[PDB]
Symmetry: C3
Subunit: 345 residues, 3 copies
């Protein structure tokens, strides 16, 4: 019925993004994606805490899908017979049938094929939503990702100037609700169903035990730091399917930020910290101007430092002393200093 060309897309694991064009002269295509549900125990923190995760394609977040405005997205959702639970998918990018949820409920051993027209530009959450209390539980178990629908002319600054990224990273932020025993130790379970009742009790109090990027504390630090170079314009897509976040690049800015995540709106310029409303994706462009380590956090610093929500960028390049310089290295305070005359003493 459609007859458009069909293009198969091979998804890649976050924080990386499958190859795509920003600007394109190709016409609308049917862009074919496969997502395979995987329930599995995963390690979420640096102490080895495990929890019964439920994922799209084995990762938290699910992979970033990228298409262009006016493409059709044909998703094969697969629920392997090794799974225990029904699953489905809601695309916040899509129109109708609860974002596709009402057309994609599949039992273990089943798959389903949904097509949705990419009529709305931006970054959007996709997440599982089987019904009722199963909706939050599948989402905070890991079952959420994002899709980016680019304008065919690529990004602009909303003032008639093209914007182009050298690199793109997808940061999925996950709130997790891990039960504790009477001693305060995280509990383990043999299956998601066995973890449910105790997890729902934690969920109800609305306070995550962990807030993680790329599915675990430390996922995107040290060896797995995100690479960049001075002069590169980097797009940082950030999603949170359930809970607000306030992203901040420590020692940088958001040059161009779509915090509500929709490219029909002009981005804000020069932000320190932006805001991802729970149930959405946003995006920030930044041109690195200085080398070194940058931390990328939610700027609830308790969440960032103590519940897992810090990533690192390692940026190669030459230091710019005009932007910042240490004028005097740490030195003993002048014995002659008169700090005891200061107005606040």
């Amino acid at each position: 019925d459609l007859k458009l060309p069909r293009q198969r897309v091979d998804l890649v694991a976050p924080p990386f993004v499958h190859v795509h064009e920003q600007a394109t002269k190709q016409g609308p295509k049917i862009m074919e994606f496969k997502l395979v549900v995987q329930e599995k125990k995963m390690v979420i923190d640096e102490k080895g805490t495990t929890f019964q995760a439920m994922t799209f394609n084995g990762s938290m977040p699910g992979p970033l899908m990228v298409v262009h405005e006016g493409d059709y997205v044909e998703v094969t959702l697969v629920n392997p017979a090794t799974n225990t639970m029904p699953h489905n998918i809601d695309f916040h990018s899509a129109t109708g049938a609860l974002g596709g949820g009402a057309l994609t409920l599949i039992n273990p051993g089943e798959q389903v094929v949904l097509r949705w027209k990419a009529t709305r530009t931006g970054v959007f959450v996709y997440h599982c939503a089987p019904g009722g209390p199963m909706i939050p539980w599948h989402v905070v178990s890991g079952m959420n990702g994002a899709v980016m629908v680019l304008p065919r002319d690529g990004l602009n600054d909303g003032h008639g100037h093209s914007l182009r990224y050298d690199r793109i990273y997808y940061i999925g932020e996950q709130d997790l609700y891990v039960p504790r025993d009477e001693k305060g130790n995280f509990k383990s379970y043999d299956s998601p169903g066995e973890a449910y009742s105790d997890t729902e009790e934690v969920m109800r109090k609305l306070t995550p035990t962990h807030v993680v990027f790329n599915g675990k504390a430390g996922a995107l630090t040290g060896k797995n730091a995100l690479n960049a170079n001075v002069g590169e314009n980097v797009l940082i897509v950030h999603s949170q399917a359930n809970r607000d976040s306030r992203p901040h690049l420590i020692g940088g800015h958001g040059d161009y930020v779509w915090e509500t995540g929709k490219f029909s709106n002009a981005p804000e310029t020069g932000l320190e910290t932006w805001f991802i409303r729970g149930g959405s994706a946003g995006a920030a462009l930044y041109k690195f101007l200085q080398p070194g380590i940058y931390a990328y956090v939610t700027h609830n610093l308790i969440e960032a430092a103590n519940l897992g929500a810090t990533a690192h960028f390692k940026v190669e390049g030459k230091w710019n002393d005009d932007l910042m310089t240490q004028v005097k290295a740490p030195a003993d305070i002048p014995t002659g200093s008169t700090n005891e005359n200061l107005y606040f003493q």
Copy 2:
């Protein structure tokens, strides 16, 4: 002193809205409204939990008032002698005297008449605010609503195009703080004053026990779903007098969203999820393009599914297979499938 024409307005119970014009050629009027305080026990959840509510006109939220820029709003606030508590009203739309609170404190058996000039366009919270700790307690007991001040030319897209709604609904979202006994069961009381001390202890921990639309879990689901038709442009006014919310229409979008709720600002286009800051109203326009059930949620899905914060729209019309279609109904996974070669296994 004023001499302008006086127009009496009959308020209607949320989520409906009293009849009004969007664009008008009438000049400024004195728009006369009556709000009557009602303290009463109300059922808030589907298990029959009751709590000692305090309301404007017997509803949570209070009714939506609609006037036009440059109208004067003359509110008679009535505090029946059957009430136990002083009450007042703060209009976030109004200028001076703590929004009118400092001019409207009335004991049981009293009424008061306040006039405020509608100088600021948008949707705004109104709420009770008697002083001190009584301010949050009266508000999270139910004593909040909204007023919409339309431009005389009606809504625009901020780019010189008129916007007109076919239908308007008012979604008041209420955080509730219901005490529990040592067993975890919700406690009942014979009066608001008797509930206060235990409720303040819950309030202090900043975690609601319920987050409800139109005063109770399930208020706007099943039989009470909101009606619409394909092709109708629907305005959805959302308020939260105390606590942030992140509205989302599942399977739809916000075509035009004023999340900060003020019509002097151009709306954002094509949002997935928006943000109502506690202490404000916002509004979203959406043109329905697909029939069926839509859920309207705060996209903290735990709040939505587990603490009461889901409404439904039932939309009549023809399905558009071009926007979305089920290409293949659920089927067993191809025995020939090679999902064990997938990159994440």
Copy 3:
């Protein structure tokens, strides 16, 4: 190497702001500031609760620094030998080295001199960030302030009209996490290090015990209310280094609000309530139109009334009955009233 003129700035205690120009015809300068770290026990609430604070210049918040775009900011950070902890500083305004943190770690008895170029306009957080879990702990112990980088032409409305304030106030909002004993009483400690382990446990649950302006409940009420006059345009800078806030001026508005706090973006007009994302500063201009007391709150009214987050403005001037008037003072309800016929009874 730089040779620009050097201008020393004497900081003043919040909520006041050191003298500065809005529009300037001076060229870029090296603006010299000194911040001295002070660890000290401070009183945070009206019951006399103390906690082991850590401050810049003895205040919560740290003082507001004001410079202009293209100035260089040369900060001497001093860590007196009477302190117990290493400290540093991260300027969200600055580019490189984690905002300066990675260049400013100083032990007790040391100082350091950092220069950063003011390339980004707006209000920005600065805060301590020594590393790891010490980052949130130093920030929620008090170690955060703000810097404003004005355009050289001063503020504009983003529509080619100059905006000028008559007065400026800096409201730093602080989330505090004070341990409680088994009885619910706040605990005291002899040193920050002794308070740490019990404070980290409170921090982890993400629910402050206090949310204060200018370092304590009641800091900016009664005798310390903020002064203004009818007709004055007041800039209200609001920062929160760790946690979201929703500012509201009760009986007023935000005429011009930069809630994300960056002057390259046009402000929103006529807001009721705005949103400061944790890790940022924002700013609102308001022209007072009515005299009397205004409360300035976070519009989580529980936080405002019950956890300390209310300031007052006392505004001198003549009452404008056209904007608002009490038409009828409180009176007994007309015996003849027919309120029992009302639709909601």
